[PDB]
């Protein structure tokens, strides 16, 4: 479960890398950064898509990119974090 | 409940990009852009309304806008994503 | 419930209002504003308190305010417009 | 619980506190000011890392931090600011 989350999330940002640095011309670790700040909807305060297919795709890509990424922070935390803390609360 | 979900989602960024390609004089697609990260709380980097009339439009509508996307993005991980990908896993 | 958690939010809200327009001068409009999109977590593209005594409000006001600031969001939407809608789905 | 989540909350944002002042030059009340912003989602308008460390570390950052900042706000309205409310509506 966690392990497919891990790879979906994975494969989405790749492909918003892969679009922002080719389309807005961004540096690959630029457009993995704005990737990631707009799926898990913190945004970025500087940039915004300046072409109208950026625009477009960015759209669609908060729709379906968005259900993914919580989904694996969720079970990241809850999964993967919760019990490396919760059993550590035992004496 | 997808389909309906689906229908006043677009149906609210439509109002929403009618409001600001009016009122704050945004090109359609920017408008759509605006409504788009406004509702699913991604923010914009660039843009704040202007006019007062654009500040309590979007006040209002970020309340009443907000739980209807989340709704969609909600169904349409769960009910349209997940499935894709759940049976995908099957062997 | 929702008239409680109306309420709780309005206060919570001329509070942030009434703060931003005295300490980092910004028009009563503009309090509001800012105040409702850093609760809601939209974010604004173009303010940021530029005095510590902001910092430090907004970081206190963020972390007791979301909450409730949803726990409206989501009976609005599930107590008050569900219905309007459910209802209205039945021929 | 409580009190877990709450010092959780404090190590990871002293995290970030020391190292955008270090990594990013930011005085130490703007990298908390940016630590807070970031993990609650609400996002800087101004401010985005500027050093390739700093942006992967905002990257790594956030899908370690958000799931532990919304678990805290989560019960801190739940289990600290509901009853408060809840038990002050007994007449
Ligand atoms: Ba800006
Ligand atoms: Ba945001
Ligand atoms: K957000
Ligand atoms: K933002
Ligand atoms: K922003």
């Given at each position: 479960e966690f392990q497919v989350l891990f790879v979906l999330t994975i494969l989405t940002l790749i492909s918003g890398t892969i679009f922002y640095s080719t389309v807005?011309?961004?540096?690959p670790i630029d457009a993995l950064y704005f990737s990631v700040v707009t799926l898990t909807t913190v945004g970025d305060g500087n940039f915004s898509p300046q072409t109208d297919f950026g625009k477009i795709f960015t759209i669609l890509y908060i729709f379906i990119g968005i259900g993914l990424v919580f989904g694996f922070i969720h079970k990241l935390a809850v999964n993967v974090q919760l019990p490396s803390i919760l059993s550590n609360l035992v004496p």
């Open positions: 807005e011309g961004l540096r």
